[PDB]
């Protein structure tokens, strides 16, 4: 009936709680170290760059791209599923993953001293 806390600090180890995660991105991995941009597939057959991004793309580039489809979609849809029916905050960016066709280049670049350009016009895409 009467029993409640008495503060909110009994020692110090009570202020790690903080997630932000989505549908199942509960601090598992996220691990890396790329800076990736984003933009609609463009092999150019000019800009053939290179230096460490593995040919392949990687889950980033495609979760930067989500984000990225994500508010470019929630616009309209640079998307290939609903170009401009959709809007959500990420069913796109999700569906297109989830139908792994990601038809867009990205560009990971290296806070070490390094970049390279492309994502699914010469390689991989989420994964």
């Known amino acids: 009936m009467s029993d409640n806390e008495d503060n909110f600090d009994g020692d110090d ?12 991105l509960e601090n598992a991995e996220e ?3 790329e800076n990736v941009e984003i933009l609609p597939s463009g092999e ?3 800009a053939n760059q ?7 793309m990687t889950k980033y580039e495609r979760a930067r791209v989500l984000g990225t489809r994500a508010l470019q979609i929630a616009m309209c849809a640079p998307v290939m599923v609903e170009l401009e029916g959709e ?3 990420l069913l ?4 297109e ?5 990601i038809p867009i280049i990205i560009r990971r670049y290296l806070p070490d001293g390094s970049y390279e350009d492309w994502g699914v016009d ?3 895409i989420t994964d």
């Not at 993953?97 to 066709?101: E, F, G, S, V």
């Open 44 to 46: 150019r057959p000019q």
């Open 97 to 101: 993953l989830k139908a792994r066709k």
């Open 31 to 33: 691990e890396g170290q």
């Open 50 to 56: 290179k230096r460490i991004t593995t040919p392949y």
């Open 122 to 124: 010469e390689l991989i």
């Open 13 to 24: 180890f009570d202020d790690v709680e903080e997630d932000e995660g989505l549908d199942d």
């Open 92 to 95: 796109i960016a999700m569906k």
């Open 87 to 89: 809007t959500d905050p």
